[PDB]
């Protein structure tokens, strides 16, 4: 609950910062790609952002349709006077070109949001490159590719400090297959969060992600650990009060250990 809620706060502040960056130029017709949208847990953040068009895509067809129904549920509120239009696409973004699936092949995006997703595409080089292409190729110049991914530096640091192939606490466990072997692609580990799931992830060496993004003319805006990001954004008072409205003034030490494995990143498309 508290970890989910804290990640929502991180996504709210992150989406909020870059919606305003986009609006500090074009306030009109803001088009967003939500790569790996999941069950639609970001729809209300895009609604509060007052965007115009949202493309939600996920690999699980089940999730895409609950995301589509959740959007239809939202637009039948009385609160949804001008809710964004949306399309919902089932696709493997690490294997399929998404513009093959758009109703408008030539559409452009101001933001691509890829939250807790891109580390599933580092199974191989072509999959990581395909996801970057689906995320960045159709970005308008000056548009943003933002997202959250595990920090490989902090992952390895804790794995070496451990004396087994595992580490964690009562909230989470990370189990690597072998210690001391960290290939750029396919470095598989299992991430278990006590409550939620058990899904295999791949290590993302961020300098590599930074270099591959250059292929689509992306320049790194910033890269922060979850702790660096929290400490910086908590100084803005409306961020601080959003934290208190969401009931996040008291995260456990065990929850900080879990959430401090992650980083946020932002790339911008050049002219
Ligand atoms: N290659 C892939 N292409 C598209 N979606 C994927 C892919 N791999 C995993 N996903 C989906 O990415 C999502 C990962 C979730 N942790 C993120 C959900 C949502 N974006 C959130 O921030 O809450 C899941 O819904 C996956 O089904």
Residue numbers in the entry: 170 to 419, 456 to 476
Quoted passage from the original study:
This basic cap structure (cap 0, m7G(5′)ppp(X)) protects RNA from degradation by nucleases during synthesis and recruits factors involved in RNA processing and translation initiation. RNMT has an activating co-factor RNMT-activating miniprotein (RAM) clamped at the interface of the catalytic domain and the modular lobe 416–456. Consequently, RNMT is a target of interest in cancers and immune disorders.
GMP-PnP was confirmed as a cap competitive inhibitor with a Ki of 2.3 µM (0.9–5.5 µM). Crystallisation of RNMT with GMP-PnP provides the first structural characterisation of a Class I methyltransferase in a complex with a cap analogue and Sinefungin. HsRNMT–Sinefungin–GMP-PnP, HsRNMT–SAH–DDD1060606 and HsRNMT–SAH–DDD1870799 co-complexes were solved, respectively, at 2.5, 2.0 and 2.4 Å in space group P21. GMP-PnP was successfully built in just one of the chains in the asymmetric unit and is located between the α-helix A and the β-strands 8/9. SAH and Sinefungin are stabilised in the active site through an identical network of hydrogen bonds, involving residues K180, G205, D227, D261, S262 and Q284, as well as 2 salt bridges with K180.
